[PDB]
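User: We ran a pulldown and think these components assemble together. Before we commit to crystallization trials, I'd like a predicted model of the whole complex to look at. Sequences follow.
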Amino acid sequence: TQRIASHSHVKGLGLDESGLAKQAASGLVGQENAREACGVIVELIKSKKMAGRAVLLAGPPGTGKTALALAIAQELGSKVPFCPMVGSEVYSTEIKKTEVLMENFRRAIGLRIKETKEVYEGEVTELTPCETENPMGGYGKTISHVIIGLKTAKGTKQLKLDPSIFESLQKERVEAGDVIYIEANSGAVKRQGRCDTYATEFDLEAEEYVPLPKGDVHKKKEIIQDVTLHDLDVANARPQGGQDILSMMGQLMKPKKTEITDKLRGEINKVVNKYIDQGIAELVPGVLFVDEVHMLDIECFTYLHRALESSIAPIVIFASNRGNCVIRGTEDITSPHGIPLDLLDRVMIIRTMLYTPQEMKQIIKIRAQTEGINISEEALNHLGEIGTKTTLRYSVQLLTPANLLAKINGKDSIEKEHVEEISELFYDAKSSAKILADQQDKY
Amino acid sequence: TQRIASHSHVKGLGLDESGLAKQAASGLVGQENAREACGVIVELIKSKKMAGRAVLLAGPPGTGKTALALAIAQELGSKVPFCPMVGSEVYSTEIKKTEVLMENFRRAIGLRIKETKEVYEGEVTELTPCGKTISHVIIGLKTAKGTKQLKLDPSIFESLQKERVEAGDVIYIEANSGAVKRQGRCDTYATEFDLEAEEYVPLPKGDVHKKKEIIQDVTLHDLDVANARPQGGQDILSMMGQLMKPKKTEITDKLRGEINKVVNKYIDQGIAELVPGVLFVDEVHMLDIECFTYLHRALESSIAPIVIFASNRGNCVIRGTEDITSPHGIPLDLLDRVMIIRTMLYTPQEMKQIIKIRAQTEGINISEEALNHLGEIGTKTTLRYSVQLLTPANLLAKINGKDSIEKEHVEEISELFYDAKSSAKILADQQDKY
Amino acid sequence: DVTRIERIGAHSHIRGLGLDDALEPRQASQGMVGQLAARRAAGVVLEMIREGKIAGRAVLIAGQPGTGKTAIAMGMAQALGPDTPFTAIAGSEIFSLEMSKTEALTQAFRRSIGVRIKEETEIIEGEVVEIQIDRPATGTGSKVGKLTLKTTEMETIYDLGTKMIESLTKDKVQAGDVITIDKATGKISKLGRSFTRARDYDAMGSQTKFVQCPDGELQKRKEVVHTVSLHEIDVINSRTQGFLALFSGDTGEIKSEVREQINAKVAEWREEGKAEIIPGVLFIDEVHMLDIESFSFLNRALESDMAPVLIMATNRGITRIRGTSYQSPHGIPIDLLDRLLIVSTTPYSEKDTKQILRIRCEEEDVEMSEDAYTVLTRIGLETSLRYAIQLITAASLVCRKRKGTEVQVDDIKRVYSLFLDESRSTQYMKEYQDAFLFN
Amino acid sequence: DVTRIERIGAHSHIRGLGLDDALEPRQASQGMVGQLAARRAAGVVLEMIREGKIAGRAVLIAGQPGTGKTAIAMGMAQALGPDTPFTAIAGSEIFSLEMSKTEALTQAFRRSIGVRIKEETEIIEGEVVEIQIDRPSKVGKLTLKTTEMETIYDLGTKMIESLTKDKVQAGDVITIDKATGKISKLGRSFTRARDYDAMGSQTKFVQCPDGELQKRKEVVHTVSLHEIDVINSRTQGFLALFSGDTGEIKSEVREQINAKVAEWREEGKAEIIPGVLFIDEVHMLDIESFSFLNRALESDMAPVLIMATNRGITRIRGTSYQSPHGIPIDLLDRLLIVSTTPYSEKDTKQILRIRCEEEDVEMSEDAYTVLTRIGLETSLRYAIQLITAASLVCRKRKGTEVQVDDIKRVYSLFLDESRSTQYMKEYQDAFLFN
Amino acid sequence: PRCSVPGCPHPRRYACSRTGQALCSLQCYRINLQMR
Amino acid sequence: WSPFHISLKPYHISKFIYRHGQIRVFNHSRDRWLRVLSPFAPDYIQRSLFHRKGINEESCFSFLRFIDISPAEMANLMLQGLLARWLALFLSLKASYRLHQLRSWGAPEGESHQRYLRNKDFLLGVNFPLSFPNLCSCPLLKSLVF
Ligand SMILES: Nc1ncnc2c1ncn2[C@@H]1O[C@H](COP(=O)(O)OP(=O)(O)OP(=O)(O)O)[C@@H](O)[C@H]1O
Ligand SMILES: Nc1ncnc2c1ncn2[C@@H]1O[C@H](COP(=O)(O)OP(=O)(O)O)[C@@H](O)[C@H]1O
Ligand SMILES: Nc1ncnc2c1ncn2[C@@H]1O[C@H](COP(=O)(O)OP(=O)(O)O)[C@@H](O)[C@H]1O
Ligand SMILES: Nc1ncnc2c1ncn2[C@@H]1O[C@H](COP(=O)(O)OP(=O)(O)O)[C@@H](O)[C@H]1O
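Assistant: Here's a predicted model for the assembly, 1932 residues in total across the polymer chains.
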């Protein structure tokens, strides 16, 4: 089965149809004004109207702003791109900071483009170059078509084909009893290998025998393929079509990120608009989420000014746990949430608050029952009291080691005496900092 | 002849058989407490059991730290790897700082690999290939000492064919390496045309077949590098190898795991033996705090060489900490991992012996009336300045048609080349003109 | 219903500077409102850009945050139209790892000069009625062949050349394909199959939507206009087969010997009448990010006859020029600030602030009551304009969640309590001050 | 006699993490001594690691220099064993010159998750005795030998081409994966080490294989999740496993591997063994890299982290800001701190006895008494270094068990921090800078 | 084709070089080497 | 007009430096041991891969069962330089079209017992919608990768 993460219980925002927040739903509790705000932001994103609008979830460590930003990803579901980042991802050694931001902006916009796949495939039981009754004037013989006798586990059927196919079957090495395929949209024939039917006819032969296909000789489906506009940036910036000397040299050299031009963005936009107008491609504008936004350089913040105002951009969710810090990449300039005031003016700020003791207890219960743990109510009351003296994170983190200790002591549920052992084995930031201050000259 | 160098006179620690220091021996003098400590370190490195164990030679400029580290290299000889590096070598531009430490830690562990070097050479009398294609190739070789036939494998014959060898060429074959070199046509065929675009070598005046038990030295870093990137693979004889220039690269710790697991598989077979060596991280105070903090893994690891640090810095700032002062320029957390050896300023008599040892190494005859003056000028200045006057003083004596130093030569040189502290007085006086 | 790649951004309502033909600013026109002095001045520089007679011109748009500096610049980018190059660069974007700062400015300059080339060639455009390809049994091996082409009006037979033959078979053209051949170059291009061959065919060798047979005369001319900028002329010339570097961004620090040769050969293409060099605009948005190294390049790059016009924006007082300790106006060194004209924007009135919110609701397809506009105007004067602009969307979304047709004042009072102004977040950060990090 | 490539390093003695079944720590066992609370905490996280049930858990082992923090992490790495990954790094190893601080941490995480897979195989493995081919299409017959049997294969057309392109001959040793038909030479049989007498540079001689000739079996494989990412980064990406020549692997590759490896555990094809990432000296991490660990500790395929640190309330690197451990508070509450405690004389005895038991040394009980004071007064990691030097002094002196006088001798040669800093403060103006 | 040890249900994998019979495993090689 | 065609005297290397001074030559007997101790030797790949002792056991080259690569293909690719790299790339371009039409249609049942990873299961870069085999297979996307 899956292994539980720090956010595996977050299943959504748990809002009413009226957009109000329930006390405890979808694995969240509390934060109601910030959950309601995220309710408006889910509508902002699902509307597909807006570009480059941005929100800043601002609040102390452990108050839930990464949980809310991930709850939005659950309210949206997998149909639309949600692109997680930290501010620290911008410090690449291969490409400038501002282009890492531009690539992450272009990841948060998805095409959803759909097409027919059609292929003819099977074990080739014959290749009959089929002649006309007489040649044309001055000729010895004429082939009007090849007949290829493809077979699969559903049946055999002959395909009539253009005579030029033989001048590709002999560029391959196709022989009777191979399994082969033909791309119905392109007429290219490709050989997979001798069919598994022949795997016994030598003690050794130098090919991987291929299992016989199932379903008809002619296969069709429509398929929906979802690509970010950043996949289109990369596939145009570094082509994979192998048979050019520069394609091979570019594929033998080390791969690299490269500073993609505004012109490639322009040309891609000019072609996806062709396919959106022709109804061939849906669009799903989505979310860029940056956590730890206070790690961006002032050049990165001053690039977000252009990027957020741009009519292409995704909805952006910022998150920050900082007070009045210095803006990174300036020496002395203190600014609220570690963000320049002229970026902080461009974003809808959402205040995320400290939990009350009862909300911490309710979260610890929801962690325990999704972490797979049974806890006694007197142990939970004690663990909520530990949380109130420390942090939500430390009091949640005591659950799995208390379950290991209970299990080692032969019991199926956390008792009072288990939590106070783990609380003595493992310190928190508040209690550890006191030890460092008392032992100041020894570290 | 060889060139004299700043240490070419030190030939060992000069300890007696009890492990105590002689006053002057193996080109060293004085320094007995540090030399006795280095005696224990030479026994530690000769004992092979230890890994990562490390030593800091600490003490003022011009007190013998690098002479004692090279004395340790001379007590061990070429038979055990001694890898010198400056802490300043860590600042590469092709790889991270904490890789250059690991490369140099892997240069200081050696493999010793015996093989019977087996050379055949001579005029090729015939080449005759013999399966239906080539089972083996018979080759015949001749020299002015006799003749042999060899049964070459087809891969050696491909190498003869790449060297464009024909009957009557003089060839060098090495039977271990499979190395082949054409050396020229045998000069008995030098009349085959009156000019041909070939060089004709006389038929070898030596054996057709020569043996040595050679004893090869190689280091784990030679293995790491030669196995990490795809090899050049061809003896030049290619042009794909024009496109991709080499660079130094961050060899992964997972490859070194396999190189260790393979070398264990060979030293168990007795095909190789290990020689745990010394890394001499000279001037370690020039490492950065990230390099120093990586040593807090590298000195613990069960594979690592012995490491000798040297430093002459006072209570100065640790490089890359922008603020933190620490003894010898080293973090206290690393200084708590090394066995420190002190180094001392000499008395004038101990300098005077070094001046004579330098003179009689450097090729200078010196009269006592001048040696007393270099002993005095050492106390007025520093040991290295006095030593640096010897060749200049001898070179004026040679121009003045004399076989030896006398007072007037060293006295003239003193008034001609300034030391680091008399020159600092000139710069302190003329402060507004520099 | 369907949503295109460009959507409602921060400036999408702006469609030009809203000047009349006597160059006076109207109070509200082409989406711009108020701001008379800076819009009038931008009209003069826009006319100077479009006149194009003089190189090496710089304009700095200056004033408080949220007062239309970027609105004017992203506004004249629309009034100048798409046919003339306008390059928007944030001052952050020149800090490359593929190239130096002075290279990234030399590219941003030269990417803002167009070389408009009109290309015309004869094309053959028809349904392929047949192809004959003849191949010798071995011999010297030269192929020879014929092609027959049809329109709804016309037909002909071409005895093909050798290079045409390898293009037709490379591109696997077949009878019933409709094709368009560049007669000057031997490049094929394919439109699709004609409908007529649903009757006789093989098991499918190709599949597409069908296309109608081409009309009229079989031979027709085509005209293309290419706005190839100088930077992309330098890249094409920097190495043989360099064309992918136009997209890939791969070429760093192109040789001066290439640029000084392109500056000669583009002048020759102007004097030959072969190409129209059109000067454009470089808009260095947030230019207070340039290092003093970059500003000193702008002192002297800005004096070539191949320099574009440039426009800058800044929202900075007396501040230290980035990369130094020296304080100066706009954070720009006086070496450059002496060399340019400064257009200064003004804070908004109530009338203008309300009128911006009123054109904004008209772009967003929002209805609000006059009571709601009144409260939102008060909010956009007490707080900054950008906050009030943003509450329009949130208030329309809250209104839609309660199934309302028009935003009321209590939807805005709701949203104002829901999403904070900076000035209110920075106040609540005082009462939880110990809980936030690194105050 | 023979010296292995891995030998006696600083933590070599701690062969585990001494615990009873109830996780009660023994006062001394598996080489570990004392530290009872920190070893319960280490045991509880060790069972949390062995469970693998929950992700991105992190433990910071914090305490004074010498108080066993790397010892607990190395004793835990031994107690966890092989067959579950344990990536160990110093925190300064993430500062690469060819990828970001994000990347070197992301790789260090991904390299600690083990995808464990079953694979079904048949391989032929033997010495080729001879090859028969006819001259019509060809149908050859080829003989394989192994120490247990001599056998013949009727072989197909493509095989005859493959064997003659790979140039097999009698007495080669070969393998062929029958499912894929790919030949692979291993060498030539030792029984054949004479049918040539000069041989190509990449010939190798091997034993003739043994057991059954066409072994049909399933084999498990463990692949660290990083290798699946590297292999997908570029077409021949596996060469960059060994070379280190990869960086900045695209997020769209890593999130594809997550979805695919999740799909394999859902299909039951492979299981995810979550290992540990140990960052010794984690206080070297930059603020830009601690802020990455914050979101790294939240993937369902993050490892369990362990960190060691040795810092008071101290300035976080890359900032002006003081914090506990030199780690940001926004990471320190995701962490779960384990506190190590200074040793008593009672414990300092037992650890020095266990190091002597590891180093193969006998000491007088009076010598352990005097050395225990030296380790208690100066530093434990200094007393742990005197015992080797005391053994070497004792061996040089022709003794056998180290006496109190041998300890006092070594202590007169090798200084600790506190004595060396005193002598530096006496000679001070001779050292450079402070 | 099947192993020529008469009790053996397995496919032919390889043949004995001495006796020429088809075989499938070491057990069938040992048995075939007995019964000839 | 045509560029100025300068030519310099060739760089003169003495017969002495050519014979004795090339490290590739004078250390060839030592360079052999860097190759004999190589973990890329097909003997050690086989022994590391199939002759492990543990019921579970970590070893390198485990990925060679899931990339297509043979032990001697990996040795030749490591010991025979950028030519062997290029030929092994050209054949991997060919093999990707064979892998893609398997990977995109062979969806039902499973590869064996609904367990065991098959050979090539680590070659995942074909599954991207924009991968060259899929981009060649589906005609629409080929126009977005222009
Ligand atoms: N027996 C000796 N005792 C001490 N020093 C000696 C002795 N023999 C040689 N030296 C002197 O060592 C000097 C140069 O190396 P030395 O170790 O003194 O450098 P250092 O300044 O102390 O250390 P570093 O190499 O870090 O600069 C030379 O003048 C050399 O003559
Ligand atoms: N409102 C919530 N309801 C339920 N669980 C929550 C909530 N907020 C936080 N959590 C839990 O507490 C943890 C701490 O919140 P997180 O978002 O990671 O902190 P931060 O705001 O600093 O980024 C979450 O990972 C989750 O386990
Ligand atoms: N004169 C204007 N006419 C129309 N919209 C304006 C005007 N001035 C400002 N705005 C709007 O106000 C917002 C902020 O103004 P902007 O020019 O982008 O900020 P800044 O002055 O700091 O560069 C944008 O949405 C912009 O369209
Ligand atoms: N509890 C212990 N049991 C065994 N060895 C220990 C113990 N504590 C410290 N040591 C030993 O002391 C030395 C230093 O301990 P270490 O953990 O590396 O110090 P630190 O925590 O400061 O990095 C090592 O040789 C180590 O094995």
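Helices of chain E lie at 26-34. That may be worth checking against your pulldown data before setting up trials.

User: Thanks, that helps.
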